[PDB]
């Protein structure tokens, strides 16, 4: 049960600051050092530097020895990455790693003078296929939101098998995402299928019942 | 963390004996992955050799694991085991050095 | 700044067959303390990377002899004697010998699997959406293989490209298939000005496009 859990998604304006955190659990925090990794959109992994979890002394790679601060809270097995004077270039997903083998689920930070925009969630119901294969595919459409990311599930997680969540796409300045789910023609409208969606940035969270 | 802690000069790793050819063959085949120098506080700041050595071990070993895993390691129960020993002999040898100089 | 040049960018391996990934550094990875800190990680679809081999060839607990790392100085290699399902995903090397540590560009590993025609289903704009004067016609093409797939939209016969956005999912860890999602969006005004909307898919599994359309007249 060696896990590293990072703080939620972030949306900040240029010049603002952020303090992303990570919590270790499952191993002796101060016996392994931690690394920090960046990943801009579409790009590869960029090593930001590391933290001696024993000494607490941080080390920044040449590009981050300017506006980045790495710190700890030994007692809580928690490391913090603070970025000051944010710039559009800072937009990316940051990771913490225990040495070189374990990563956190990541943390997506977005920096832009663009204001948040909740996403409009639309259900999606059949019309074609019915029982020529016996399966039925329902969907859900989340469009026109900003920034990334949005969280979606079916029936608050209970329905995870046979589901397909496609990567968000960029519009003018809004992301649209889609997701499908397939079940046996019988179980619907037999059972109730609901689409769960949350757009952290907009402190939003919506659900949509799907019907014929 | 390491305030007041010194890095002693390098020294040959002590040849410790672990009866079985294997676990013994392990140390010889894995000692490059172990330290060959120790962190410590001035020998005077301690009442005896035991306090000193005990502090030196925890500091050396730990410092060693955090700075190496940072680059990419994996210290198993055996790695830690064979290390406490090795580092302990080294810390004691460090004690002689330091004391021998006071 | 050490540069890791991992190749190939992609691999399609048949289960039971080998597979070797290469990672060349622009400078020796023989760190000052005598070790060579080269790490091989695997990042499955959806997951976070996970290390399999560290220090060039030491296997992390639970990893099979199948995988073996080797090389030195500047040439390293991740070898998989017998590949299999669980192996699919993105592999990459990470070096921790020099400041700053650097990663290789990645090597997406695909595990071949029997062919499969994309399951297609189309969806007319939802009610709540038209109320605002926007019409999005979604089309899902799930669980197919090979990955190569082409999608075309036809509004009342004529081909349409404006207002279309597509999306792809990586290979599936479960069934090794790929899935696509195409969304045709236009104004409600234009929408209602047309009748039948079609979603044509062109896949290896069929010498003819796999169609799916609906007429606005709900007819």
Swiss-Prot record, chain B:
Residues with glycosylation annotation: 58, 74
Disulfide bonds: 56-91
Domain comment (free text): The normal, monomeric form has a mainly alpha-helical structure. The disease-associated, protease-resistant form forms amyloid fibrils containing a cross-beta spine, formed by a steric zipper of superposed beta-strands. Disease mutations may favor intermolecular contacts via short beta strands, and may thereby trigger oligomerization.
Function in brief: Its primary physiological function is unclear. Has cytoprotective activity against internal or environmental stresses. May play a role in neuronal development and synaptic plasticity. May be required for neuronal myelin sheath maintenance. May play a role in iron uptake and iron homeostasis. Soluble oligomers are toxic to cultured neuroblastoma cells and induce apoptosis (in vitro). Association with GPC1 (via its heparan sulfate chains) targets PRNP to lipid rafts. Also provides Cu(2+) or Zn(2+) for the ascorbate-mediated GPC1 deaminase degradation of its heparan sulfate side chains.
Family statement: Belongs to the prion family.
Subunit structure, as described in the record: Monomer and homodimer. Has a tendency to aggregate into amyloid fibrils containing a cross-beta spine, formed by a steric zipper of superposed beta-strands. Soluble oligomers may represent an intermediate stage on the path to fibril formation. Copper binding may promote oligomerization. Interacts with GRB2, APP, ERI3/PRNPIP and SYN1. Mislocalized cytosolically exposed PrP interacts with MGRN1; this interaction alters MGRN1 subcellular location and causes lysosomal enlargement. Interacts with KIAA1191.
Name of the protein in its database record: Major prion protein
Gene of this entry: PRNP
Residue window of the full protein shown: 127 to 228 of 256
């Amino acid at each position: 049960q060696i896990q590293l859990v990072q703080s939620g998604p972030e949306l900040k304006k240029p010049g603002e600051t952020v303090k992303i955190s990570c919590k270790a659990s499952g191993y002796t925090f101060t016996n392994y050092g931690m690394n920090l990794v960046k990943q801009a959109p579409g790009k590869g992994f960029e090593w930001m530097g590391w933290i001696n979890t024993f000494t607490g002394e941080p080390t920044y790679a040449d590009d981050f020895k300017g506006r980045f601060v790495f710190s700890l809270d030994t007692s809580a097995s928690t490391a913090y990455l603070q970025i000051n004077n944010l710039k559009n270039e800072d937009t990316a997903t940051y990771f913490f790693t225990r040495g070189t083998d374990y990563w956190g689920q990541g943390t997506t930070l977005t920096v832009s003078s663009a204001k948040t925009t909740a996403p409009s969630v639309y259900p999606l119901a059949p019309v074609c296929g019915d029982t020529t294969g016996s399966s039925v595919t329902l969907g859900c459409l989340v469009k026109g939101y900003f920034p990334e990311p949005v969280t979606l599930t079916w029936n608050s997680g209970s329905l995870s098998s046979g589901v397909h969540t496609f990567p968000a796409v960029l519009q003018s300045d809004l992301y649209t995402l889609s997701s499908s789910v397939t079940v046996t023609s019988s179980t619907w409208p037999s059972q109730s299928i609901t689409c769960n969606v949350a757009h952290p940035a907009s402190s939003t969270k919506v659900d949509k019942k799907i019907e014929p | 963390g390491l305030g007041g802690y010194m890095l002693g000069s390098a020294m040959s790793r002590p040849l410790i004996h672990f009866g079985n050819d294997y676990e013994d063959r392990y140390y010889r085949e894995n000692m490059y992955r172990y330290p060959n120098q120790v962190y410590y506080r001035p020998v005077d700041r301690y009442s005896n050799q035991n306090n000193f050595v005990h502090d030196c071990v925890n500091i050396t070993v730990k410092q060693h694991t955090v700075t190496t895993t940072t680059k990419g390691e994996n210290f198993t129960e055996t790695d830690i085991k064979i290390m406490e020993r090795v580092v302990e002999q080294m810390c004691i040898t460090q004690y002689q050095r330091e004391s021998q100089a006071y | 700044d050490v540069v890791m040049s991992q190749t190939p960018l992609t691999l399609s391996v048949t289960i039971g067959q080998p597979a070797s990934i290469s990672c060349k550094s622009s400078q020796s990875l023989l760190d000052s303390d005598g070790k060579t800190y080269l790490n091989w990680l695997l990042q499955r679809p959806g997951q976070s990377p996970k290390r399999l081999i560290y220090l060039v060839s030491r296997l992390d607990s639970g990893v099979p002899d199948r995988f073996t790392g080797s090389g030195s100085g500047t040439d390293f290699t991740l070898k998989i004697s017998r590949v299999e399902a669980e192996d699919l995903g993105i592999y990459f090397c990470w070096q921790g010998s020099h400041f700053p540590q650097t990663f290789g560009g990645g090597t997406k590993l695909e595990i071949k699997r029997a062919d499969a025609a994309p399951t297609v289903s189309i969806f007319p704009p939802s009610s709540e959406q038209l109320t605002s004067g926007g019409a999005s016609v979604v089309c899902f093409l799930n669980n197919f293989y090979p990955k190569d797939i082409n999608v075309k939209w036809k509004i009342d016969g004529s081909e349409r490209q404006n207002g279309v956005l597509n999306s792809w999912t990586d290979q599936d860890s479960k069934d090794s298939t790929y899935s696509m999602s195409s969304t045709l969006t236009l104004t409600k005004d234009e929408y209602e000005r047309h009748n039948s909307y079609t979603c044509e898919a062109t896949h290896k599994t069929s010498t003819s496009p796999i169609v799916k359309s609906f007429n606005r007249n709900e007819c």
